[PDB]
Design an enzyme around this catalytic site. Structure first.
Site, PDB file in Angstrom:
ATOM      1  N   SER A   1       0.911  -0.963  -0.012  1.00  0.00           N
ATOM      2  CA  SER A   1       0.054  -0.217  -0.026  1.00  0.00           C
ATOM      3  C   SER A   1       0.763   1.032  -0.166  1.00  0.00           C
ATOM      4  O   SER A   1       2.009   1.127   1.078  1.00  0.00           O
ATOM      5  CB  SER A   1      -0.992   0.228   1.487  1.00  0.00           C
TER       6      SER A   1
ATOM      7  N   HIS B   1      -0.367   3.425   0.801  1.00  0.00           N
ATOM      8  CA  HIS B   1      -0.595   4.221   2.612  1.00  0.00           C
ATOM      9  C   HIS B   1       0.682   4.198   4.033  1.00  0.00           C
ATOM     10  O   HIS B   1       0.802   4.827   4.687  1.00  0.00           O
ATOM     11  CB  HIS B   1      -1.360   4.183   3.009  1.00  0.00           C
TER      12      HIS B   1
ATOM     13  N   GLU C   1     -10.537   5.123  -7.848  1.00  0.00           N
ATOM     14  CA  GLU C   1     -10.983   5.130  -5.756  1.00  0.00           C
ATOM     15  C   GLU C   1     -10.457   6.726  -5.672  1.00  0.00           C
ATOM     16  O   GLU C   1      -9.041   7.595  -5.445  1.00  0.00           O
ATOM     17  CB  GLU C   1      -9.734   4.857  -5.053  1.00  0.00           C
TER      18      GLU C   1
ATOM     19  N   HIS D   1      -7.731   8.379  -3.532  1.00  0.00           N
ATOM     20  CA  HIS D   1      -7.157   8.364  -2.646  1.00  0.00           C
ATOM     21  C   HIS D   1      -5.834   9.445  -3.583  1.00  0.00           C
ATOM     22  O   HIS D   1      -5.578   8.974  -5.166  1.00  0.00           O
ATOM     23  CB  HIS D   1      -6.849   6.666  -3.802  1.00  0.00           C
TER      24      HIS D   1
HETATM   25 ZN   LIG Z   1      -6.500   5.132  -0.269  1.00  0.00          ZN
END
Ligand SMILES: [Zn+2]
EC number: 3.4.17.-
Length: 181
Positions: free
Chosen positions: A99, A101, A151, A154
């Site tokens: 990810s 993230h 998404e 994001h």
């Molecule tokens: Zn995300």
């Protein structure tokens, strides 16, 4: 370049990847290097009457696993076996280690709800984020390259130079990096 690091299912975060994190007012954390750019982005949105929030910044390995498991459970409840659900969940939530993230370079940006709707914020980000070094990482017309569904929350920091080129050429990050050879 540090801001062009590729993280996806084929490119895990390096072992021992160091990130220095800053805490935002809401307790979400980001790579300190993107802090002024994210602030400039938020300042510009609000100057346009668009009111975003950082729903999710940095995530630890365990947080990523939990988010992934919760998505798997949502699919299981809609009539998927565990194996089907895992494969379907991955089009939305990356396996831990893959990810963005976990870099501190990605933020999920939502609307505050009360002054702006999700779609107002998502539209503003689509049209403006690149000016502050952020890209709409998983666009709807590149799912076959990114491996990720649409998404619109994001956003990934790559820096103003790369973001602007990516935006003008209508690319995803993988294409941009491939074209640089
Ligand atoms: Zn995300």
């Amino acid at each position: 370049e540090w801001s062009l690091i590729l993280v996806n299912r084929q490119n895990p975060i390096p072992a021992q990847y160091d990130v220095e994190l800053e805490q935002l007012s809401n307790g979400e954390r980001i790579d300190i290097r993107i802090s002024p750019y994210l602030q400039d982005l938020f300042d510009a949105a609000r100057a346009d009457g668009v009111y975003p929030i950082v729903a999710s910044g940095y995530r630890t390995t365990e947080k990523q696993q939990e988010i992934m498991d919760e998505k798997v459970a949502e699919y299981k409840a809609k009539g998927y076996t565990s194996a089907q659900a895992k494969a379907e969940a991955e089009t939305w939530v990356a396996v831990p280690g893959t990810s963005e993230h976990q870099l501190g370079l990605a933020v999920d940006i939502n609307a505050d709800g009360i002054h702006s709707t999700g779609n107002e914020v998502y539209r503003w980000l689509d049209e403006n984020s690149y000016r502050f070094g952020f890209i709409r990482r998983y666009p709807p017309d590149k799912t076959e390259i990114t491996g990720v569904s649409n998404e619109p929350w994001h956003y990934r920091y790559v820096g103003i130079e790369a973001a602007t080129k990516i935006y003008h050429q209508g690319l995803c990050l993988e294409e941009y990096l491939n074209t640089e050879k």
